[PDB]
Enzyme design. Sequence first.
Site, PDB file in Angstrom:
ATOM      1  N   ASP A 123      11.237  75.665  42.753  1.00 28.79           N
ATOM      2  CA  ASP A 123      11.656  76.958  42.188  1.00 28.79           C
ATOM      3  C   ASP A 123      11.560  78.133  43.164  1.00 28.79           C
ATOM      4  O   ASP A 123      10.913  78.062  44.221  1.00 28.79           O
ATOM      5  CB  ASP A 123      10.901  77.258  40.864  1.00 28.79           C
ATOM      6  CG  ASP A 123       9.518  77.863  41.045  1.00 28.79           C
ATOM      7  OD1 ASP A 123       8.995  78.031  42.167  1.00 28.79           O
ATOM      8  OD2 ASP A 123       8.917  78.262  40.011  1.00 28.79           O
ATOM      9  N   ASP A 161      10.483  82.156  43.825  1.00 25.40           N
ATOM     10  CA  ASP A 161       9.449  83.120  43.419  1.00 25.40           C
ATOM     11  C   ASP A 161       9.717  84.498  44.034  1.00 25.40           C
ATOM     12  O   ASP A 161       9.846  84.640  45.254  1.00 25.40           O
ATOM     13  CB  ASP A 161       8.068  82.642  43.870  1.00 25.40           C
ATOM     14  CG  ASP A 161       7.830  81.197  43.545  1.00 25.40           C
ATOM     15  OD1 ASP A 161       8.208  80.322  44.371  1.00 25.40           O
ATOM     16  OD2 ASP A 161       7.348  80.913  42.424  1.00 25.40           O
ATOM     17  N   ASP A 191      10.658  82.423  39.186  1.00 24.15           N
ATOM     18  CA  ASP A 191       9.539  83.220  38.750  1.00 24.15           C
ATOM     19  C   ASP A 191       9.701  84.654  39.267  1.00 24.15           C
ATOM     20  O   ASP A 191       9.980  84.891  40.455  1.00 24.15           O
ATOM     21  CB  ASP A 191       8.213  82.653  39.253  1.00 24.15           C
ATOM     22  CG  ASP A 191       7.823  81.380  38.577  1.00 24.15           C
ATOM     23  OD1 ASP A 191       8.271  81.097  37.432  1.00 24.15           O
ATOM     24  OD2 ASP A 191       7.115  80.578  39.240  1.00 24.15           O
TER      25      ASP A 191
HETATM   26  N1  LIG Z   1       2.213  75.932  40.761  1.00 21.62           N
HETATM   27  C1  LIG Z   1       1.079  76.651  40.808  1.00 21.62           C
HETATM   28  N2  LIG Z   1       1.007  77.673  41.700  1.00 21.62           N
HETATM   29  C2  LIG Z   1      -0.113  78.432  41.799  1.00 21.62           C
HETATM   30  C3  LIG Z   1      -1.259  78.155  40.924  1.00 21.62           C
HETATM   31  N3  LIG Z   1      -2.224  79.035  41.218  1.00 21.62           N
HETATM   32  C4  LIG Z   1      -1.702  79.804  42.171  1.00 21.62           C
HETATM   33  O1  LIG Z   1      -2.329  80.760  42.732  1.00 21.62           O
HETATM   34  N4  LIG Z   1      -0.458  79.487  42.521  1.00 21.62           N
HETATM   35  C5  LIG Z   1       0.307  80.097  43.613  1.00 21.62           C
HETATM   36  C6  LIG Z   1       0.326  79.068  44.738  1.00 21.62           C
HETATM   37  C7  LIG Z   1       1.768  78.592  44.892  1.00 21.62           C
HETATM   38  O2  LIG Z   1       2.164  78.269  46.241  1.00 21.62           O
HETATM   39  C8  LIG Z   1       2.483  79.814  44.361  1.00 21.62           C
HETATM   40  C9  LIG Z   1       3.892  79.589  43.823  1.00 21.62           C
HETATM   41  O3  LIG Z   1       3.874  78.407  43.058  1.00 21.62           O
HETATM   42  P1  LIG Z   1       4.984  77.284  43.081  1.00 21.62           P
HETATM   43  O4  LIG Z   1       4.598  76.274  42.064  1.00 21.62           O
HETATM   44  O5  LIG Z   1       6.371  77.938  42.996  1.00 21.62           O
HETATM   45  O6  LIG Z   1       4.737  76.578  44.525  1.00 21.62           O
HETATM   46  P2  LIG Z   1       5.608  76.550  45.873  1.00 21.62           P
HETATM   47  O7  LIG Z   1       6.570  77.751  45.866  1.00 21.62           O
HETATM   48  O8  LIG Z   1       4.535  76.540  46.942  1.00 21.62           O
HETATM   49  O9  LIG Z   1       6.232  75.123  45.691  1.00 21.62           O
HETATM   50  P3  LIG Z   1       7.770  74.639  45.534  1.00 21.62           P
HETATM   51  O10 LIG Z   1       8.435  75.686  44.690  1.00 21.62           O
HETATM   52  O11 LIG Z   1       8.183  74.659  46.951  1.00 21.62           O
HETATM   53  O12 LIG Z   1       7.706  73.328  44.833  1.00 21.62           O
HETATM   54  O13 LIG Z   1       1.663  80.304  43.294  1.00 21.62           O
HETATM   55  C10 LIG Z   1      -1.095  77.011  39.991  1.00 21.62           C
HETATM   56  O14 LIG Z   1      -2.043  76.684  39.234  1.00 21.62           O
HETATM   57  N5  LIG Z   1       0.066  76.334  39.982  1.00 21.62           N
HETATM   58 CA   LIG Z   2       6.970  79.147  40.946  1.00 24.64          CA
HETATM   59 CA   LIG Z   3       8.384  77.971  44.363  1.00 22.04          CA
END
Ligand SMILES: Nc1nc2c([nH]c(=O)n2[C@H]2C[C@H](O)[C@@H](COP(=O)(O)OP(=O)(O)OP(=O)(O)O)O2)c(=O)[nH]1
Ligand SMILES: [Ca+2]
Ligand SMILES: [Ca+2]
Length: 327
Positions: free
Chosen positions: A193, A195, A251
Amino acid sequence: MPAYACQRPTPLTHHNTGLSEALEILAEAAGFEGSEGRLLTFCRAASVLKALPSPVTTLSQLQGLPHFGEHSSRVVQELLEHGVCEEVERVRRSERYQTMKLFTQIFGVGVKTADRWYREGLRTLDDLREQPQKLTQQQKAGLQHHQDLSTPVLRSDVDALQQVVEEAVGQALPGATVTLTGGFRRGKLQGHDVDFLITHPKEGQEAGLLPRVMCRLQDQGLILYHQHAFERSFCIFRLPQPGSWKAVRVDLVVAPVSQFPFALLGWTGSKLFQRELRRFSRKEKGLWLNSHGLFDPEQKTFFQAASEEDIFRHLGLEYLPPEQRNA
DNA sequence: CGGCATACG
DNA sequence: CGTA
DNA sequence: GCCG
Ligand SMILES: Nc1nc2c([nH]c(=O)n2[C@H]2C[C@H](O)[C@@H](COP(=O)(O)OP(=O)(O)OP(=O)(O)O)O2)c(=O)[nH]1
Ligand SMILES: [Ca+2]
Ligand SMILES: [Ca+2]
Ligand SMILES: [Cl-]
Ligand code: NA
């Protein structure tokens, strides 16, 4: 090798990919059984291997590395000797693992829900679709959109999307800014996703912004799903494709400019990096960290930060750019 | 043995 | 409970 | 599962 992931650089690509992946399967399985301690150890051991400057080729190279005890070392040993770890393969093929993974991947389903469904005898997505009155509205959207949401979002998709969000944000509040966070800011070329962190340079102007942003995006026909005062929105958005479109998870989060560095740090991740940073802060420095600020509970004061650099300095840590936070 | 990050929707 |  |  320091014990906490926030004390060492971890690049996105590294020299121990197969070993780390194996340990992360065991971490994931531990989480499906509600064993958060074992999930953390296996994640931490995997991350240690990501931080090494060359491949592990012999068992003795694990001597003195933190988070490698009897269990994690035996996993690496078997992989080094046979190319495969029987425990990991047994997990990979368990019905429990495969189903819990399938279910928890659904937007609106966590471990606790997946586990309950599992105990009820449910195994497939079509099992869930047969009894839809049992689903929350969020789970219904997750299930309907599951196929598109299982496809990686490409970094090459993101700029066009950021431009549509920026247009909506600029109408909601002129001067407000949009910053790409998450795994893309860490250098990833794909992700599950997108962000975005939103602020305004005048403290207090951001109050009540997110609902205004969401109403405008919805009016543009871009929002397939959203929960709706609020400051985080977990959306499903319409992303253009050749002749069509696909659903993607986005997000959106608002912070006051005073909090922006803490929010940027938090949302940039990785998840393990943030957990480790917050653990380090509290346990080693006696300071309480979250995505809003950093609190000294003795002085009862918040540390002002103008940059991520300030935050690493207030914690006594060497600065790591986002590309080295891939713990 | 206790602890394991810390929030918001 | 879900979400990051 | 591991550290401290
Ligand atoms: N998913 C997730 N992210 C968290 C948590 N706590 C927290 O601080 N975060 C922070 C760290 C993550 O790198 C960031 C954004 O989350 P994300 O799930 O979109 O992770 P990402 O961008 O690193 O991964 P992706 O989209 O590449 O799969 O939010 C949690 O419990 N779950
Ligand atoms: Ca996210
Ligand atoms: Ca992400
Ligand atoms: Cl927070
Ligand atoms: Na889920």
